[PDB]
Scaffold this active site. Structure first.
Site, short mmCIF file in Angstrom:
data_model
loop_
_atom_site.label_atom_id
_atom_site.label_comp_id
_atom_site.label_asym_id
_atom_site.label_seq_id
_atom_site.Cartn_x
_atom_site.Cartn_y
_atom_site.Cartn_z
N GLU A 71 -59.73 24.48 -29.86
CA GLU A 71 -59.29 23.56 -30.91
C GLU A 71 -59.51 22.12 -30.50
O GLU A 71 -59.04 21.21 -31.20
CB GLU A 71 -57.81 23.78 -31.25
CG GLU A 71 -57.51 25.13 -31.88
CD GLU A 71 -56.94 26.11 -30.89
OE1 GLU A 71 -56.67 27.27 -31.27
OE2 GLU A 71 -56.75 25.72 -29.73
N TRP A 130 -37.86 27.05 -15.73
CA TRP A 130 -39.05 27.75 -16.21
C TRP A 130 -39.98 27.99 -15.02
O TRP A 130 -40.67 27.08 -14.57
CB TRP A 130 -39.77 26.95 -17.29
CG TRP A 130 -38.91 26.51 -18.42
CD1 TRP A 130 -37.82 27.16 -18.92
CD2 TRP A 130 -39.04 25.30 -19.18
NE1 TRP A 130 -37.27 26.43 -19.96
CE2 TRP A 130 -38.01 25.29 -20.13
CE3 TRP A 130 -39.94 24.24 -19.14
CZ2 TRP A 130 -37.85 24.25 -21.04
CZ3 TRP A 130 -39.78 23.20 -20.04
CH2 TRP A 130 -38.74 23.22 -20.98
N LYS A 152 -37.54 32.18 -19.09
CA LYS A 152 -36.45 31.22 -18.99
C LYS A 152 -35.26 31.83 -18.24
O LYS A 152 -34.30 32.35 -18.82
CB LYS A 152 -36.04 30.74 -20.38
CG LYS A 152 -37.00 29.73 -21.00
CD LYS A 152 -38.20 30.42 -21.64
CE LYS A 152 -39.09 29.43 -22.36
NZ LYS A 152 -40.35 30.07 -22.84
N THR A 180 -60.32 31.63 -33.98
CA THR A 180 -59.73 31.95 -32.70
C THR A 180 -58.59 32.88 -32.89
O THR A 180 -57.87 32.79 -33.84
CB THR A 180 -59.13 30.69 -32.03
OG1 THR A 180 -58.14 30.11 -32.87
CG2 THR A 180 -60.18 29.63 -31.73
#
Lengths: 530, 530, 530
Positions: C319, C434, C429, C172
């Site tokens: 994954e 966020w 940020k 990946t």
């Protein structure tokens, strides 16, 4: 298994082939049936080893035996352990259900069974699995055991393996719901033989087993290895006589004719032998019977002593080798008259070599040896079973506190003498003390109209477990419970309230339950009456 | 136990806390007694974990359960394995002797027992050891289980351990002399749930368990994990209904009122439910009963199919998870009429995912799947018991040849369908062939005056084991053995001499022995009549 | 490797030879090229095993595959892992440099490559070492794969080994400088198949894969095991259709003619299929496409729903098996109209069986599931890659805190629904909060004259990383940055200063950099513009 010859393993084959003494012309006698020298015994052991190897018996396999005392059992005591297998001893006195349970639990591969024990098998035959062959034993030429030995050679090379391999196993009832299996190794059996021979062989002039004796079992021999005596006698190379069915007039004839000098029996058989009319005119002053069943009574010991019989007691309880203690009399104790003789000879006795034998409380407090303070006996010996077979929680109660718990309550004198008072479970807890029921039963049995007595415990809020007496009356005897209460109250010299006489609660019952072996069913009564 | 988080262990706690679906307001219903949502079920599981920890239950300990199907048992199916202990399931239908044997063998620490099962314990209470606490269960507020849970908090942190730790155990009778113990691990139970859900959940339109169903056990739930259904249903987050005593008119009322759509039962209970008058006017066309006890008969299946019940059979035998095969009908098999429907639905069925299921002879020869060649079924699955607990030689016969031996004789079709013919031990060996006794019993039962039939084998020198028939006659019926012999001879189409009609040897007996569960005692008859 | 048959290993060979269902006449179709039943598929798998053994492939060896979706790849999905080798899947969409890097890193022994992928190899041919054979695949009779299979026999005995042996691997990209290798074992793949089949197979009436479906991949199949679908479909024994080149008018023809009912694709291909004129008059109301590429948009979902397509989304990230969550609609959610339908079907979805899926902050604080509090997703599943191949420090950031870090920022509803907001690295940020850039890009894309938008972060001392917008204008459209600033300022309902409108800093750029796969190069822009 690879072994350097420097490292020595204690095995039963060394016990047989490296004895204290070996006399080739010394004989083994099966009562009026067979008679053959020690050479023949060795040849037959090797033949039996060959036959077992031919049947597929391996090192881990187990062989079960069910017969009386005979040459065949002595051969099984040796051949099966040497080849590496386990000798499982079956108690023929148990119920068929218990026998089937033990056979299933031990997973026996081959079963040697006597002919007249066949009906017992007939009703559990289909329930049994994992058993491949049955060998029927007989007292005539039709025996399958003899036929199997003849087909074999007298040569055999016995293997050498680790001394910690299991050799023998048998099952004990006890207080549990199912029989418990106990096992011993080669090293333990060899050490037991060495230790007991060192203890009783070195006595000065009383109760000693030496190389000039003639041995005869009167213990069933499937119970405690016959107290290890067949292993000892074979090591001394002494003449061995096996009676079989334990008939009193066959036993007396054999003692008269074969000149038997050493034996072990139980109080009931000894009483039968002494009371039999044929023994009224038979010499007894060469005989050294050892009483080991349970509680050699003073009256029986005195009556045997008047016949010039060297009668003495020993202690062992099926998980301890069995031998733990034997009474030995010092030279100044031999000069006492019969009244003091029967006092000492009836005790549990001093512990044998390599035994610790402490007295303790639930707290493991190791009570002093004053002479009257009683407690449970906990022992450490080279020949104790490490645990019960296939059992975990019972095994942990067996070895609680780092010692083996016998379950017997006794007090130990300063000199070393042990006197067992009762059992731990038969202790009844009045207030804060523990009085024994055996003394109460003995006191109640002193009544002229009382046949048998059993004393049990019943709950009571303020005084814990208090006594209850069940008595059986003799022929045409009718004594009220009040009379027995008063008779027990008449005695003196005991602790508790006055003399603990307000709660005897004697009751008259026609019969008292007994085990299949012949012991009182105190637990089923704990169930029936409360 | 130290674990890296990368390595994943298959545990039952993951089955409960990581389900396929979780609905907090979904309910668990104990019949007309209790009703609480899944939130309450999770809280009660954590409370039960706290209570067990307070009682001294450890990772290795064992807890025994003896009650009916209820919320409590579902909580025991989870709480006891998570904390690490072993859940021992007690067959309440065995004799007290067998129950006592299993309790002693498993060495249970704590016993949860229902109130009306107390008399069974009362006669084995004193024989039991190694048990420290009894928890009495009741259907009212006086339950000790509820009192113990209230004293606890709803918080608990469930441990993570190896997936191979034993979770559940129970005992099976079988053909042995004593019950045999089988055990499973966390991984096996999780895999069984996954595999069976993948097999039956993915069916197109017939016999599928999905997230919209309502579940009800009618299997005793102490036998085969209730076919693993409680583990599956909890994972789907479906409504669960527990009846308790399995009364037909309480079961029918519960199906009517709670709208049950999935169940598993045995042919006897299904026949009772179908024949009950109250069911004559009750809708059944949403119900998917699975028959798994033994040999779903064609007549019962047809009668259930006329009621629009999706009835189908499954196979499992107490050492195999239990599920090994389930009947699944393809879309073109749903168009057949009831006669062909009952033919397929009554079969053993195709094997489920991850099962091998070969047919073999004593030589392990792997007979072909022609459709008529019969042989023993030997399987390999992810959820088979490795051996019997505390057993060696029976364990080796269980896994002989590298496969698990079920003991059932069947033939497998080309498409995959399995049809079990008989048992291995019930095979009778005429000459060189093996004919089944079930077909003979079915043929003899077709007589108008015959109540029940049992066919056994008897020795004969030239023809091996030949047949014998024991029949019970109906009310005021007297047919000679000659008539039954002729009636059996009248049929055709079988091998052996003519149609194997010279040795039927039918005999009339008033009654036939039966097990405590209700199965014919073919072995005790093998004993009584020969 | 020596194994007792009691211990069961979860292997892919059990997935193929012990399915949920096996239909010998069921077919595998390669689009207008080949068609052969499941019997032929099994024979070809065994032939391929023989051919690989003849070439010197061993248990530890690795075989690389580079082609489209076809029967050959399905055969590679099975044959290579069974024989014990590693199946390396090559992303044909990477640059030749990255492909060469992955081939060198995995150390492939044998490479199977399609003919029209040959030019890609031609420019990295000399750089490649450790590769001994190239097998050229073709769609006609000249294929070397077919020639190699014909020379072999259909018999083969597949080995049994440990379930933890690596089966498949692929690389990946991600955010790292080089591709990262992820690997899975036999046990993980089998468990993934079981779990996903249990989750989606048990749905009541929506979005379920059952044994009556016809399967078709539209995902490249060298990326995430094609979401594990080929392993699942083979286990159900369903018809499988492989298109090859993914041409929209070939895909539509195949769905029309082969009657495809289950598929998985990406939003771009689905939009192409829906917008193609040939699909304007083609029935779609039997099709269950699963969207798993990235961020199924609401408009596309609504347009597909107006065509009666059971469209739903799933989450997986290369994954993690890959499947972690799938949207499932409850029976009362099926009654909502299309506006609410597209709201639910576009979400990330509830987590599948055996998945934990917590939301956390850098402190691993496990934020609550209120519905608006966002955080990184950290998961624990039975099928997660333990680490990156030949990597240490990246592996420790992957499994930081005892959980696998997906890198996606999402908020989880109370009922369980997950809605992914952005990526962890794409979080900017401002001050102490966020905010996500995806919502800003969506808002800016709502402009009538805006083609594409990318939002990035730039440093600022007092307010941390503040926003910047790069936009591409449509044909003959010229809107100043002031107009876009005002258009974004016009909206309401957000935190930060006013509505965080003083730092949008929109800029007009002719083009925006994109990866070789077709994703925005936010990192190279982080490089170009600052």
């Amino acid at each position: 298994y690879v072994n350097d010859p420097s490292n020595y393993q204690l095995l039963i084959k060394n016990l047989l082939f490296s004895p204290v003494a070996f006399n080739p012309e010394q004989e083994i006698v099966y009562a009026n049936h067979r008679r053959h020298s020690y050479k023949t015994f060795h040849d037959r052991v090797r033949q039996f080893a060959n036959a077992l190897t031919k049947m597929g018996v391996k090192k881990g396999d187990t062989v079960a035996v069910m017969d009386y005392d005979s040459h065949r059992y002595l051969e099984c005591y040796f051949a099966i352990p040497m080849i590496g297998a386990k000798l499982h001893m079956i108690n023929v006195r148990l119920s068929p259900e218990q026998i089937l349970y033990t056979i299933d639990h031990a997973e026996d591969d081959i079963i040697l069974i006597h002919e007249e024990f066949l009906p017992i098998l007939d009703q559990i035959k289909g329930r049994i699995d994992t058993v491949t062959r049955y060998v029927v034993l007989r007292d005539d030429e039709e025996c399958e055991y003899e036929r199997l030995l003849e087909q074999e050679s007298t040569e055999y090379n016995f293997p050498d393996f680790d001394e910690n391999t299991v050799a023998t196993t048998f099952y004990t009832t006890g207080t549990t719901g199912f029989p418990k299996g106990v096992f011993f190794t080669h090293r333990q059996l060899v050490l037991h033989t060495m230790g007991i021979l060192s203890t009783i062989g070195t006595n000065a002039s009383q109760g000693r087993l030496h190389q000039g004796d003639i041995y005869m079992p009167i213990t069933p021999m499937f119970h405690v290895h016959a107290w290890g005596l067949p292993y000892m006698a074979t090591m001394l190379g002494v003449k061995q006589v096996y009676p079989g069915k334990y008939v009193p007039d066959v036993l007396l004839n054999l003692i008269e004719q074969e000149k038997v000098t050493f034996s072990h029996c139980v109080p009931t058989i000894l009483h039968l032998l002494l009371s039999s009319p044929k023994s009224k005119a038979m010499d007894f002053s060469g005989w050294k019977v050892v009483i080991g069943g349970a509680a050699l009574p003073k009256a029986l010991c005195k009556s045997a002593l008047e016949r010039d019989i060297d009668v003495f007691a020993g202690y062992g309880m099926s998980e301890t080798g069995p031998i733990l203690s034997i009474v030995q009399l010092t030279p100044e104790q031999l000069e006492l008259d019969v009244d003091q003789q029967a006092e000492y000879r009836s005790k549990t006795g001093k512990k044998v070599a390599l035994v610790e034998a402490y007295i303790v409380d639930e707290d493991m407090n190791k009570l002093p040896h004053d002479g009257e303070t009683a407690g449970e006996i906990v022992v450490r010996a080279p020949w104790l079973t490490p645990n019960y077979y296939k059992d975990n929680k019972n095994s942990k109660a067996l070895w609680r506190g780092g010692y083996l718990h016998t379950g017997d309550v006794a007090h130990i004198d300063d000199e070393g003498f042990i006197k067992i008072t009762d059992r731990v479970k038969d202790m009844i807890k009045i207030s804060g003390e523990w009085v024994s029921s055996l003394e109460l039963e003995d006191i109640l049995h002193q009544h002229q109209s009382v046949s048998e007595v059993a004393v049990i415990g019943m709950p009571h809020n303020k005084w814990g477990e208090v006594p209850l007496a069940l008595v059986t009356l003799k022929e045409d005897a009718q004594v009220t419970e009040k009379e027995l209460l008063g008779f027990a109250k008449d005695f003196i010299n005991k602790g508790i309230l006055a003399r603990e006489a307000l709660l005897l609660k004697v009751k008259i019952v026609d019969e008292i339950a007994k085990t299949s072996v012949g012991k009182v069913d105190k637990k089923e009564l704990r169930k029936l009456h409360l």
